[PDB]
Enzyme design. Structure first.
Site, PDB file in Angstrom:
ATOM      1  N   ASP A   1     -41.874  14.839  14.121  1.00 37.78           N
ATOM      2  CA  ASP A   1     -41.664  14.322  15.448  1.00 37.78           C
ATOM      3  C   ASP A   1     -40.205  13.784  15.484  1.00 37.78           C
ATOM      4  O   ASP A   1     -39.670  13.372  14.413  1.00 37.78           O
ATOM      5  CB  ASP A   1     -42.658  13.230  15.826  1.00 37.78           C
ATOM      6  CG  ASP A   1     -42.390  12.502  17.115  1.00 37.78           C
ATOM      7  OD1 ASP A   1     -42.657  13.094  18.253  1.00 37.78           O
ATOM      8  OD2 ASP A   1     -41.938  11.352  17.135  1.00 37.78           O
TER       9      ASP A   1
ATOM     10  N   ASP B   1     -48.554  11.769  19.185  1.00 36.25           N
ATOM     11  CA  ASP B   1     -48.710  12.345  17.864  1.00 36.25           C
ATOM     12  C   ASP B   1     -50.123  12.199  17.319  1.00 36.25           C
ATOM     13  O   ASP B   1     -50.414  12.754  16.254  1.00 36.25           O
ATOM     14  CB  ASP B   1     -47.720  11.700  16.888  1.00 36.25           C
ATOM     15  CG  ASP B   1     -46.279  11.901  17.304  1.00 36.25           C
ATOM     16  OD1 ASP B   1     -45.929  13.039  17.671  1.00 36.25           O
ATOM     17  OD2 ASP B   1     -45.495  10.928  17.260  1.00 36.25           O
TER      18      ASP B   1
ATOM     19  N   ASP C   1     -45.234   9.019  14.968  1.00 35.64           N
ATOM     20  CA  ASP C   1     -45.350   7.591  15.227  1.00 35.64           C
ATOM     21  C   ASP C   1     -46.096   7.124  16.479  1.00 35.64           C
ATOM     22  O   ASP C   1     -46.844   6.146  16.421  1.00 35.64           O
ATOM     23  CB  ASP C   1     -43.943   6.999  15.303  1.00 35.64           C
ATOM     24  CG  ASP C   1     -43.181   7.488  16.524  1.00 35.64           C
ATOM     25  OD1 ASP C   1     -43.108   8.717  16.737  1.00 35.64           O
ATOM     26  OD2 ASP C   1     -42.692   6.642  17.301  1.00 35.64           O
TER      27      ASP C   1
HETATM   28 MG   LIG Z   1     -42.706   9.373  18.800  1.00 36.83          MG
END
Ligand SMILES: [Mg+2]
Ligand SMILES: C=C(/C=C\C[C@@H](O)[C@@H](O)[C@H](O)C/C=C/C=C\[C@@H](O)C[C@@H]1O[C@H](C[C@@H](O)[C@H](O)C[C@H]2O[C@H]([C@H](O)[C@H](O)CC[C@H](O)/C=C/[C@H](C)[C@@H](O)C[C@]3(O)O[C@H](C[C@@H](O)CCCCCCC[C@@]45C[C@@H](C)C[C@@](C)(O4)[C@@H](C[C@@H](C)CCCCC[C@@H](O)[C@H](O)[C@H](O)[C@@H](O)[C@H](O)[C@H]4O[C@H](C[C@H](O)[C@H](O)/C(C)=C/[C@H](O)C[C@@H](C)[C@H](O)C(=O)N/C=C/C(=O)NCCCO)[C@H](O)[C@@H](O)[C@@H]4O)O5)[C@H](O)[C@@H](O)[C@H]3O)C[C@@H](O)[C@@H]2O)[C@@H](O)[C@H](O)[C@H]1O)CC[C@H](O)[C@@H](O)[C@H](O)[C@H](C)C[C@H]1O[C@H](/C=C\[C@@H](O)[C@H](O)C[C@@H]2C[C@@H]3C[C@H](O2)[C@@H](CC[C@H]2O[C@H](CN)C[C@H]2O)O3)[C@@H](O)[C@H](O)[C@H]1O
Ligand SMILES: *[C@@H]1O[C@H](CO[C@@H]2O[C@@H](C)[C@@H](O)[C@@H](O)[C@@H]2O)[C@@H](O[C@@H]2O[C@H](CO)[C@@H](O[C@@H]3O[C@H](CO[C@H]4O[C@H](CO)[C@@H](O)[C@H](O)[C@@H]4O)[C@@H](O)[C@H](O[C@H]4O[C@H](CO)[C@@H](O)[C@H](O)[C@@H]4O)[C@@H]3O)[C@H](O)[C@H]2NC(C)=O)[C@H](O)[C@H]1NC(C)=O
Ligand SMILES: CCCCCCCC/C=C\CCCCCCCC(=O)OC[C@H](COP(=O)(O)OCC[N+](C)(C)C)OC(=O)CCCCCCC/C=C\CCCCCCCC
Ligand SMILES: CCCCCCCC/C=C\CCCCCCCC(=O)OC[C@H](COP(=O)(O)OCC[N+](C)(C)C)OC(=O)CCCCCCC/C=C\CCCCCCCC
Ligand SMILES: CCCCCCCC/C=C\CCCCCCCC(=O)OC[C@H](COP(=O)(O)OCC[N+](C)(C)C)OC(=O)CCCCCCC/C=C\CCCCCCCC
Ligand SMILES: CCCCCCCC/C=C\CCCCCCCC(=O)OC[C@H](COP(=O)(O)OCC[N+](C)(C)C)OC(=O)CCCCCCC/C=C\CCCCCCCC
Ligand SMILES: CCCCCCCC/C=C\CCCCCCCC(=O)OC[C@H](COP(=O)(O)OCC[N+](C)(C)C)OC(=O)CCCCCCC/C=C\CCCCCCCC
Ligand SMILES: CCCCCCCC/C=C\CCCCCCCC(=O)OC[C@H](COP(=O)(O)OCC[N+](C)(C)C)OC(=O)CCCCCCC/C=C\CCCCCCCC
Ligand SMILES: *[C@@H]1O[C@H](CO)[C@@H](O[C@@H]2O[C@H](CO)[C@@H](O)[C@H](O)[C@H]2NC(C)=O)[C@H](O)[C@H]1NC(C)=O
Ligand SMILES: CC(C)CCC[C@@H](C)[C@H]1CC[C@H]2[C@@H]3CC=C4C[C@@H](O)CC[C@]4(C)[C@H]3CC[C@]12C
Ligand SMILES: [Mg+2]
Lengths: 993, 294
Positions: free
Chosen positions: A346, A691, A687
């Site tokens: 990410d 996600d 995070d």
């Molecule tokens: Mg993020």
């Protein structure tokens, strides 16, 4: 919980009006709802709070661990053992107890293993709880025309809600009136900068429009109003968290290797049994006794220390990880990192820092770079010119943000700053290499400031000059470089001033495009000394008319800024690519920024090119170029929505440097699946909440610890409590290291098998006294073997592990036939021969030569024959011959230990030689010493012949196994030698584990 | 999968390899196992060379000697009906098997059975344990010595009318000299009378104090009429140096045995190099359970 309706991409009613909205949910735009109506809805559908996770009791999580791993092999072993003790007990009052012991022991190996694994999974959960913090929050709702602050759990659909910069959006709102309101859509949508929320509509995609506020987002600056459109679990992040909860886990790779291990072990068990069944029938036995023989051989092929040894093996590597701040919730998730071959990462919050920082600066016709790293470990930018000082005064003065009270402890970059992200980045850079801005600001008093205007496109202000020799007035202004360029006529070069001829104007244009092409945002700073003769120290310049010369200013230099990547991000990406790991960027951010960060971190190697880049370099349409000449590709989310399964397969099959931009959370999951449909392991590192569904379906999820969301943190498998990214490299290394060692320990615990079953086979077929008793096998199975097997984990690498390609799952297993050919076929055979040697020696020295032992079992075990003639004619009572058989069991066990010495040494290394690697492993040395001390202790302590049935040995018998050991060592040494000199030869494809 | 891993026809493979692979592996294992066998055999031949043919290197596990008996009773119980003949057959077949080795026809000529004192005597040393003077000579032991239990008069040996016999025997040990207790003031009660130094005494009794009364007259038959073993049949030189050797025997008739009741009779030998063990119930002594149920 319909998953297909939750897998679909979000839909909405954004494209409407304020009248249509108020007409659909029912609500006064200027008076809101009524309290009675509000409560009628509050009770009608449920509070605005996400559902709690499905909980579970502790005895449940202990039953799971009891019926797991290979605790099934051992559960039956235990059940079978107690069944035989039952039948043997009710049939005769004098039965042997090799079963009540064998069963309570086996059972203990299962209960103890479960307790250890459990304790581990609980240890991780407590530290996981000490992070779930929740300070109550309350929203501002307008009912009956009045403003009231009520708990977040009491907001319903339809009432009016007001927000203010610093508060959190309670539910999904539909903005009706805003006043320069900005929101942080980083966790849900992944937008690094604050998107302004306007009552008007702008994009067909609800996540892109500005007339909708979202759940869990925060209003950075400004105030706004809005009608609650979505409430409770029905919210966006509510449907997403619901998707995370309603997905599967997967099946870890390590669990598949262990399953294949049990497969082969049972294969060989039914083979030895059906074969010794036909053989026993060929010898004259009946079908009942022969059937019982098939049962005993299958039970012997059960490694009980393999379970405890494997558990301790896995447990040791997890501590090394916890020492560097890498915590795993499960226990097998420690190996998945090493087997990974495709890491899906990410950008916002994982690849980056989600905080704005001053990157490049323009001054003295020269680009200067500033340190944009967390711990400030880099290069300074030459703070010796006067130009830089003037720049520091411009930025430090013409800026209204200030550090939040009480930050005197945190570092200069991690402290809280109240204001826009640009003034904050500038304030931090000035406070970083120019000292305290608070004194720099009080050193020059601000007289008059004209705030940033939508028409002026600039921010200016006048302050007094701290020069004790010059009482004039200083004027500073910042703004877009084009607007400011149109307002200057001089340039502060190296301190002195110079005209603005086209030479420097073109150098300024190239500098603007240089900082712009870098994906950064540039600003221009200029200042001017107001003549104290035309504007004395007493004249007040009220902000009304042209009191300051807009033009004829002195431009000092440009100042760019952008969110930089974390310190070890480029190096780690390079290390992963070196190990043959395909790095694919997957983010919901703007492609113009995603491509730049990709090239900056190594995903898009410098030199590779996209189809649009080729069309731009040639000046031809894009539909003409061939897509095979482009190694790297940028796939847009909007285009990803309209793509078939085969197209995605081809995208991953032909492009080596792929970057998926503007992808929704639901799309992130589709990409991970597109990688798995073809056959490989995946690790997703993220995070935020977007996600959550990607970390769950990935073979291994890695969530950030400080910057991560609670949902993705609870749905992940590995947590980075320090937010350091190098831990990923450490993990992929440890995952391999602990794999080659499991191979060694398995071959070790499997070699001792053969010398444990052959005695009984020669007993039934050849009719000789029992060579290896049951309480001795137990002593080797859980005594000698364990410490050494546990030590085999501390073995260092032989060659560079961070240099080989990822293991193929369909071909390179954990336990192949090459291992079985060594343990069961070559080493175990030699160990068995050595044991039978010490045996015959003990019986020949006391009186029974090898010719008279064949055919004696029937009379050797009779309890009523007190006169058994030996090879010399002596008469031996029953108990007298039994004492000798027991002493033969003791020496057989000691022979096993002696041959295990050379087996632990030849198992230490797989290919390399002992004179190369070296005996630097102190644990292995301790294992050998303890392994010998235990055997001597069990054989010479008063009271063993009454408890365990092990008699003392005469000193000349301990040397009967030494030659076999030396031979094992020499054989394996020459074996490891031909593999080295002859790569790919017979010895390699036949004996190389 | 299922079919292909078994037999494919393009690479001409069976189970996975071709013909030349199965041959390379089979040949390797044959040579490897052949070397293993030859090494084990060599290490066993050197073992045949280490030891001696006339004497076991270690003789500590068989001392003192045991005391076995005929018949062959399982659990040390002799139970039989005086009416049903098919009740004491398993016993007689054993008794007979034991006495069938003392037949006079077997003991004939000068060798290797020499005539010895008809009355107990002292030891006899036929030299050392060597092959110098060939095969040694052993004393003859006649059947008739055992008077009422010999199978020569009443084949059954007693079991026919409620009067059984028990032929006791001392375990044969190489170079073992039996040493009886001396006439000093310390000696069991029983042993005082008939102190024939040259005789190793054997005396049976009742395990419990109660059973005494229920046990009748223990009549011992032996060499010279004494209840023991004559020292002249020792020592034993081993099978290799004394084939055709006969060990003394002692018959015991349990006359006047109470009917329909389990009697525990413990027999015990006495002597210096004789020691009992609480774990081995056959070292020096022996136990028998007799129940003549009729
Ligand atoms: Mg993020
Ligand atoms: C509890 C356990 C189990 C047992 C425990 C046991 O001990 C105890 O609990 C006891 O049981 C307690 C139980 C008590 C129960 C009751 C008692 O309370 C009560 C009392 O019991 C007392 C008895 C008791 O005293 C007894 O004695 C106890 C012992 O019992 C066992 C005995 O021995 C023995 O079984 C006696 C049983 C009985 O006698 C058997 C009778 C027969 C079944 C049957 O025939 C009888 C009868 O006929 O059955 C009829 C019913 C019928 O419907 C049935 C139908 C029949 C089906 C026929 C088809 C057959 C079949 C089947 C096909 C699949 C294959 C096929 C080939 O055969 C095929 C072929 C066809 C075509 C054949 C057709 C034939 C037809 C036959 C039938 O028709 C019938 O026979 C027929 O109808 C008959 O009626 C008729 O008479 C027939 O007669 C003839 C037939 C023949 O006979 C017959 O066919 C024959 C011979 C076949 C032959 O095979 C043929 C061969 C020749 C051959 O083919 C041949 O030629 N070869 C020629 C070769 C040749 O030339 N070569 C030339 C070479 C040239 O080069 C004739 O031919 C026929 O025509 C004719 O029709 O089809 C019917 O009822 C009647 O009819 C009946 O009479 C033994 C024990 O069980 C026990 O001690 C009584 O006296 C008393 O009165 C009573 O009150 C669990 C075990 C433990 O788990 C385990 O630990 C165990 O303990 C160890 C293993 C012990 C071992 O080790 C010990 C020391 C230490 C050990 O403990 C250690 O622990 C070892 C460990 C082990 C492991 C490994 C290691 O080491 C350690 C490590 C482990 C640890 O480490 C690990 C890590 N590494 C971790 C951890 O695991 O653990 C030792 O001490 C032990 O000794 C040792 O064993
Ligand atoms: C050691 O000595 C054993 C006894 O020797 C006998 O007595 C000594 C003192 C000498 O006089 C010697 O010459 C005697 O023979 C000797 O065992 C004996 O062997 C013979 C030969 O087989 C047996 O004779 C046979 O008897 C059966 C029936 O036996 C019944 O009694 C015995 C107990 O005595 C039971 O065990 C049986 O079940 C029976 O109840 C006869 O049926 C059989 O008939 C055969 O001979 C007749 C002619 O007489 C023929 O018409 C038939 O066809 C048969 O061929 C024999 O008469 C004798 O029973 C047996 N004695 C005992 C006590 O078992 C033993 O073999 C010698 N061993 C060695 C190693 O020297
Ligand atoms: C008293 C006397 C004492 C007796 C003691 C006996 C002790 C027993 C000692 C050893 C047990 C031997 C049992 C057999 C072991 C075979 C090992 C085995 O089955 O391992 C499994 C392997 C799989 O491996 P993988 O993971 O790479 O598969 C990957 C497949 N993917 C990738 C395509 C999916 O499968 C394979 O190897 C394929 C299967 C091959 C099977 C070969 C069978 C050979 C057995 C006997 C031969 C005897 C002949 C004697 C005569 C010689 C002529 C003179
Ligand atoms: C007839 C009887 C048959 C018996 C058969 C069974 C035998 C099995 C038991 C023992 C086998 C011993 C084999 C000896 C091997 C010695 C190898 C050796 O010496 O290789 C030298 C290595 C290599 O160094 P390098 O160049 O890589 O260093 C670089 C340093 N830099 C980096 C600073 C430059 O140096 C090192 O490993 C560092 C120093 C390590 C010193 C190890 C000494 C301990 C050795 C054995 C322990 C004894 C066990 C006894 C068990 C019985 C218990 C009762
Ligand atoms: C860094 C940390 C280092 C720590 C190292 C620790 C090492 C510890 C070293 C030694 C302590 C061991 C335990 C001591 C046992 C003393 C037993 C004892 O003094 O017995 C004396 C009496 C024997 O008397 P008697 O001769 O008259 O009997 C005549 C019997 N007749 C005539 C009937 C045959 O005993 C009896 O009677 C009954 C016998 C009772 C049996 C107890 C044996 C326990 C069995 C298994 C446990 C061993 C597990 C292995 C642990 C390894 C740890 C490293
Ligand atoms: C980390 C490294 C660990 C290393 C440790 C080695 C692991 C050992 C693994 C398996 C061994 C356990 C097997 C238990 C054997 C029990 C034997 C038993 O119960 O025999 C019963 C005997 C009766 O004998 P008899 O009929 O001849 O008596 C005749 C008496 N008359 C004639 C005078 C009346 O009674 C007696 O001996 C009475 C004395 C009772 C002695 C109990 C000794 C228990 C020993 C171990 C249990 C604890 C081990 C836990 C450690 C696990 C390690 C993972
Ligand atoms: C790579 C392989 C390494 C293997 C290492 C094995 C080490 C073994 C360690 C010790 C050996 C066991 C101790 C032997 C003690 C025997 C005691 C005994 O009672 O013996 C007697 C018999 C002789 O009996 P007889 O009937 O002929 O007497 C006739 C007498 N009259 C003529 C008067 C009638 O003696 C005999 O058999 C002696 C015959 C023994 C021949 C085996 C030689 C073993 C080779 C080397 C040993 C290691 C020493 C060097 C260390 C090197 C370190 C690197
Ligand atoms: C008490 C216990 C005692 C135990 C003692 C055990 C001693 C026995 C040791 C070895 C005997 C086995 C020799 C077997 C020779 C026939 C094997 C054969 O037919 O092989 C053919 C190949 C040549 O075919 P290729 O590769 O060109 O075809 C390529 C084909 N494709 C693609 C499949 C690779 O052969 C090759 O490669 C060459 C490979 C030859 C194998 C070398 C193994 C040497 C191992 C140990 C010797 C050390 C003994 C030390 C003992 C000291 C005692 C004190
Ligand atoms: C053998 O035992 C019997 C008892 O079973 C003894 O004879 C008994 O003697 C008492 C007098 O003490 C009489 O009252 C009984 O009537 C007798 N019973 C029988 C069956 O005779 C006999 O004395 C014992 N004989 C020997 C030699 O011990
Ligand atoms: C290193 C390896 C291959 C050497 C193996 C050597 C084998 C073949 C040797 C070692 C010891 C040898 C044995 C030693 C003693 C005897 C006794 C004799 O009356 C017959 C031959 C026989 C049985 C030998 C046969 C061959 C033998 C087994
Ligand atoms: Mg997972």
């Amino acid at each position: 919980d319909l998953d297909e309706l939750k897998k679909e991409v979000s839909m909405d009613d954004h494209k409407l009006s304020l009248d249509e909205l108020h007409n659909k949910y029912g609500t006064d735009l200027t008076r809101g709802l009524t309290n009675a109506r509000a409560k009628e809805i509050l009770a009608r559908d449920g509070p605005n709070s996400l559902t709690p996770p499905p909980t579970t009791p502790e005895w449940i999580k202990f039953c799971r661990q009891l019926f797991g791993g290979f605790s099934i092999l051992l559960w039956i072993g235990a059940i079978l053992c107690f069944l035989a003790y039952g039948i043997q007990a009710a049939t005769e009052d004098e039965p042997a107890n090799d079963n009540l012991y064998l069963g309570v022991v086996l059972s203990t190996v299962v209960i103890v293993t479960g307790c250890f694994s459990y304790y581990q999974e609980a240890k991780s959960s407590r530290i996981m709880d000490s992070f779930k913090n929740m300070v109550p929050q309350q929203a501002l709702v307008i009912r009956d025309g009045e403003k009231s602050t009520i708990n977040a759990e009491f907001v319903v659909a339809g009432d009016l809600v007001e927000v203010k910069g610093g508060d959190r959006i309670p539910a999904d709102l539909r903005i009706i009136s805003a006043h320069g309101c900005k929101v942080d859509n980083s966790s849900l949508t992944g937008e690094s900068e604050p998107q302004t929320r306007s009552p008007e509509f702008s994009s067909e995609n609800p996540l892109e429009t500005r007339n909708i506020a979202f759940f869990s987002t925060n209003c950075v600056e400004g105030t706004a109003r809005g009608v609650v459109v979505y409430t409770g679990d029905r919210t966006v992040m509510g449907r997403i968290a619901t998707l995370a909860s309603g997905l599967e886990v997967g099946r870890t790779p390590i669990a598949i290797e262990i399953e294949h291990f049990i497969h082969i072990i049972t294969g060989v068990a039914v083979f030895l049994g059906v074969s010794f069944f036909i053989l026993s029938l060929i010898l004259g036995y009946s079908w009942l006794e022969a059937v019982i023989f098939l049962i005993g051989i299958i039970v012997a092929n059960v490694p009980e220390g393999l379970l405890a040894t494997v558990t301790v093996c896995l447990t040791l590597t997890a501590k090394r990880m916890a020492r560097k701040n890498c915590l795993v919730k499960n226990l097998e998730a420690v190996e998945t990192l090493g087997s990974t071959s495709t890491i899906c990462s990410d950008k916002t919050g994982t690849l980056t820092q989600n905080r704005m920082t001053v990157a490049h600066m323009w001054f003295d016709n020269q680009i200067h770079e500033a340190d944009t790293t967390e711990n400030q470990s880099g290069a300074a930018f030459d703070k010796t010119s006067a130009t830089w000082s003037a720049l520091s005064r411009i930025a430090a003065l013409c800026n209204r943000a200030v550090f939040q009270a009480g930050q005197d402890n945190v570092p200069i970059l991690k402290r809280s700053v109240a204001g826009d992200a640009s003034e904050s980045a500038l304030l931090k850079c000035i406070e970083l290499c120019c000292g305290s801005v608070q004194g720099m600001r009080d050193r020059n008093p601000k007289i008059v400031e004209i705030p940033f205007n939508s028409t002026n496109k600039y921010q200016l202000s006048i302050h007094e000059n701290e020069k004790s020799s010059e009482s004039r007035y200083l004027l500073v202004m910042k703004g877009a470089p084009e607007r400011i360029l149109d307002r200057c006529s001089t340039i502060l070069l190296n301190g002195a001033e110079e005209p603005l001829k086209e030479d420097m104007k073109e150098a300024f244009q190239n500098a603007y495009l240089e900082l712009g092409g870098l994906g950064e945002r540039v600003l221009g700073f200029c200042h001017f000394a107001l003549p104290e003769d035309k504007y004395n120290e007493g004249y007040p310049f009220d902000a009304d008319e042209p009191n300051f010369p807009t033009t004829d200013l002195c431009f000092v230099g440009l100042m760019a800024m952008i969110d930089p990547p974390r310190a070890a991000v480029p190096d780690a990406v390079g290390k992963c690519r070196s190990a043959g790991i395909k790095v694919i960027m997957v983010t919901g951010d703007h492609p113009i920024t995603a491509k730049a960060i990709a090239k900056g971190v190594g995903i898009i190697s410098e030199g590779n090119e996209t189809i649009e880049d080729i069309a731009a370099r040639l000046n031809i349409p894009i539909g003409q170029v061939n897509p095979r000449d482009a190694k790297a590709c940028v796939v847009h989310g909007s285009d990803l929505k309209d793509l078939s399964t085969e197209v995605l397969d081809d995208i991953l099959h032909y492009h080596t440097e792929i970057v998926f931009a503007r992808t929704s959370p639901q799309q992130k999951l589709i990409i991970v699946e597109g990688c798995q449909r073809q056959g490989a392991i995946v690790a997703v590192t993220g995070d935020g909440v977007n996600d959550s569904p990607a970390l769950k379906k990935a073979d291994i999820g890695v969530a950030m610890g400080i910057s991560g969301s609670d949902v993705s943190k609870q749905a992940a498998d590995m947590i980075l409590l320090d937010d350091n990214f190098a831990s990923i490299v450490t993990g992929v290394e440890e995952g391999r290291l602990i794999f080659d060692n499991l191979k060694k320990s398995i071959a070790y615990t499997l070699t001792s098998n053969i010398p444990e079953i052959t005695p009984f086979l020669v007993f039934i077929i050849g009719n000789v006294p029992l060579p290896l008793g049951t309480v001795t096998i137990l002593c080797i199975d859980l005594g000698t073997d364990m410490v050494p097997a546990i030590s085999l984990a501390y073995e260092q690498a032989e060659s560079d592990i961070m240099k080989r390609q990822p293991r193929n799952p369909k071909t390179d297993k954990l336990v192949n036939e090459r291992l079985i050919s060594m343990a069961y076929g070559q080493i175990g055979m030699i160990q068995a021969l050595g044991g039978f040697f010490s045996y015959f020696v003990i019986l020949a020295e006391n009186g029974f030569l090898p010719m008279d032992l064949i055919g004696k079992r029937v009379r050797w075990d009779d309890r009523w024959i007190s006169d058994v003639e030996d090879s010399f004619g002596q008469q031996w009572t029953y108990e007298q011959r039994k004492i000798v058989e027991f002493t033969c069991h003791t020496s057989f066990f000691i022979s096993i230990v002696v041959v295990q010495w050379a087996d632990l040494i030849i198992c230490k290394t797989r290919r390399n030689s002992i004179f190369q690697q070296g005996m630097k492993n102190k644990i292995l040395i301790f294992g050998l010493f303890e392994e010998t001390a235990l055997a001597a202790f069990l054989s010479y302590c008063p009271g063993t012949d009454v408890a365990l049935r092990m008699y003392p040995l005469k000193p000349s018998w301990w040397f009967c196994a030494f030659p076999y050991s030396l031979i094992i060592f020499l054989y394996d040494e020459m074996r490891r030698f031909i593999i080295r000199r002859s790569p790919g030869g017979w010895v390699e494809q036949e004996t190389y584990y | 999968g299922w079919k292909k891993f078994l037999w494919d026809s393009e690479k001409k493979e069976f189970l996975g390899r071709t013909g030349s692979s199965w041959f390379k592996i089979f040949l390797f294992y044959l040579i490897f196992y052949g070397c293993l066998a030859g090494i084990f055999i060599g290490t066993i031949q050197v073992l045949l060379l280490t030891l001696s043919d006339f004497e076991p290197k270690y003789q500590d596990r068989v001392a003192p000697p045991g005391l076995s008996h005929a018949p062959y009773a399982i659990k040390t119980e002799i139970s039989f009906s005086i009416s049903n003949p098919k009740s004491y057959e398993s016993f007689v077949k054993s008794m007979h098997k034991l006495m069938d080795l003392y037949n006079e026809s077997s003991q004939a000529g000068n060798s290797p059975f020499e005539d010895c004192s008809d009355t107990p005597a002292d030891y006899i040393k036929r030299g050392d344990l060597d092959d110098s003077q060939g095969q040694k000579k052993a004393c003859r032991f006649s059947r008739m010595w055992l008077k009422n239990c010999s199978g020569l008069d009443d084949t059954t040996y007693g079991y026919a009318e409620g009067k059984p016999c028990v032929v006791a025997k001392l375990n044969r040990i190489i170079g073992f000299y039996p040493k009886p207790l001396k006439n000093t003031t310390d000696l069991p009660e029983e042993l005082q009378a008939n102190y024939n130094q040259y005789v190793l005494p054997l005396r049976c009794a009742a395990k419990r104090e109660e059973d005494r009364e229920k046990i009748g007259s223990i009549e011992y038959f032996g060499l010279g009429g004494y209840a023991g073993f004559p020292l002249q049949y020792y020592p034993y030189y081993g099978k290799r140096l004394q084939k055709k050797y006969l060990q003394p025997l002692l018959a015991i008739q349990f006359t006047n045995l109470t009917q329909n009741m389990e009697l525990r009779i413990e027999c015990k030998v006495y002597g210096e190099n004789i020691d009992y063990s609480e774990k081995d119930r056959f070292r020096g002594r022996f136990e028998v359970k007799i129940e003549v149920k009729s």
